[PDB]
Write a protein that holds these residues in place. Structure first.
Motif, PDB file in Angstrom:
ATOM      1  N   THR A   9      26.901  65.344  95.185  1.00 18.55           N
ATOM      2  CA  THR A   9      27.760  65.424  94.012  1.00 18.55           C
ATOM      3  C   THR A   9      27.320  64.404  92.970  1.00 18.55           C
ATOM      4  O   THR A   9      26.538  63.497  93.264  1.00 18.55           O
ATOM      5  N   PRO A  10      27.797  64.534  91.726  1.00 15.73           N
ATOM      6  CA  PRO A  10      27.497  63.493  90.728  1.00 15.73           C
ATOM      7  C   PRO A  10      27.935  62.103  91.158  1.00 15.73           C
ATOM      8  O   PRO A  10      27.223  61.123  90.902  1.00 15.73           O
ATOM      9  N   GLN A  11      29.092  61.993  91.811  1.00 18.79           N
ATOM     10  CA  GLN A  11      29.553  60.693  92.286  1.00 18.79           C
ATOM     11  C   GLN A  11      28.616  60.132  93.349  1.00 18.79           C
ATOM     12  O   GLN A  11      28.281  58.942  93.324  1.00 18.79           O
ATOM     13  N   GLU A  12      28.173  60.974  94.286  1.00 18.77           N
ATOM     14  CA  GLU A  12      27.280  60.501  95.339  1.00 18.77           C
ATOM     15  C   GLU A  12      25.909  60.132  94.782  1.00 18.77           C
ATOM     16  O   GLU A  12      25.309  59.137  95.207  1.00 18.77           O
ATOM     17  N   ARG A  13      25.391  60.921  93.837  1.00 15.71           N
ATOM     18  CA  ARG A  13      24.104  60.597  93.223  1.00 15.71           C
ATOM     19  C   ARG A  13      24.176  59.283  92.454  1.00 15.71           C
ATOM     20  O   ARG A  13      23.240  58.474  92.496  1.00 15.71           O
ATOM     21  N   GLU A  14      25.276  59.062  91.733  1.00 16.94           N
ATOM     22  CA  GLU A  14      25.464  57.805  91.016  1.00 16.94           C
ATOM     23  C   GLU A  14      25.465  56.624  91.976  1.00 16.94           C
ATOM     24  O   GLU A  14      24.838  55.591  91.713  1.00 16.94           O
ATOM     25  N   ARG A  15      26.175  56.760  93.097  1.00 12.44           N
ATOM     26  CA  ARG A  15      26.232  55.690  94.086  1.00 12.44           C
ATOM     27  C   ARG A  15      24.842  55.337  94.601  1.00 12.44           C
ATOM     28  O   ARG A  15      24.512  54.155  94.750  1.00 12.44           O
ATOM     29  N   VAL A  65      22.381  59.467  85.750  1.00 19.27           N
ATOM     30  CA  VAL A  65      21.547  58.877  86.792  1.00 19.27           C
ATOM     31  C   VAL A  65      20.334  58.183  86.182  1.00 19.27           C
ATOM     32  O   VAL A  65      19.939  57.098  86.624  1.00 19.27           O
ATOM     33  N   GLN A 108      15.805  62.048  95.099  1.00 22.91           N
ATOM     34  CA  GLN A 108      16.497  61.675  93.875  1.00 22.91           C
ATOM     35  C   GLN A 108      15.578  61.119  92.797  1.00 22.91           C
ATOM     36  O   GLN A 108      16.016  60.983  91.650  1.00 22.91           O
TER      37      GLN A 108
END
Lengths: 63, 63, 63, 63
Positions: B12-18, D3, A42
């Motif tokens: 996903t975008p949600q998982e990357r944000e987390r 991100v 990431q």
């Protein structure tokens, strides 16, 4: 008079240890979070540099 | 086959944000702890360099 | 009559130390919290003045 | 790129509130400890001045 000393004396070894333990605990937590991010690939190189620069600014480390 | 995609698809975008919020949260905690240490003049320049080098090692940032 | 003295006598050195130790511990906690706030540049000069005036009011320090 | 923003963006209102909440909590604890000391008449005027000067030094408040 030790009463005056309680307010005036600089940080004791126990107090100094407590402040360092908090730095160490935050460093471990950052390693945990960064370790997961690096595992999922990431962090790009610019993103890594920005995190490193942020920490150096916290530290007032002028390098 | 959406069920296959649930296991196969990249983050996903949600998982990357987390994952990044966890990095941010640890970065804030480190600034809090270092901010207190710097206030009580607890970090020498070698100590600052060691903390910075530790973070760069976490990041796999070869600089 | 030592039993009377237990109720009547002024604060002992041990008791005086415990009270001032509590003041020192709160002072350290405040330096830790203010140190982090100052590190993130969260305190303006009026805000600093209000915190200082609050403490002087606690102290009954008329300056 | 949200991100990137998670690492780069300045402190959020929630984060700023958490830091200042920590300052408030320490201020209350100091009022509690000083309130007890003042009640037992444990603080002389020079001692009060030293506590106030310590806090102003934390604040980087040059007054």
């Amino acid at each position: 008079g030790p009463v005056v000393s309680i307010i005036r004396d600089d940080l004791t070894p126990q107090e100094r240890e407590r402040l360092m333990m908090r730095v160490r605990a935050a460093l471990v937590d950052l390693g945990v979070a960064v370790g997961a991010s690096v595992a999922f690939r990431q962090l790009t190189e610019p993103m890594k540099s920005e995190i490193a620069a942020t920490v150096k600014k916290y530290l007032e480390y002028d390098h």
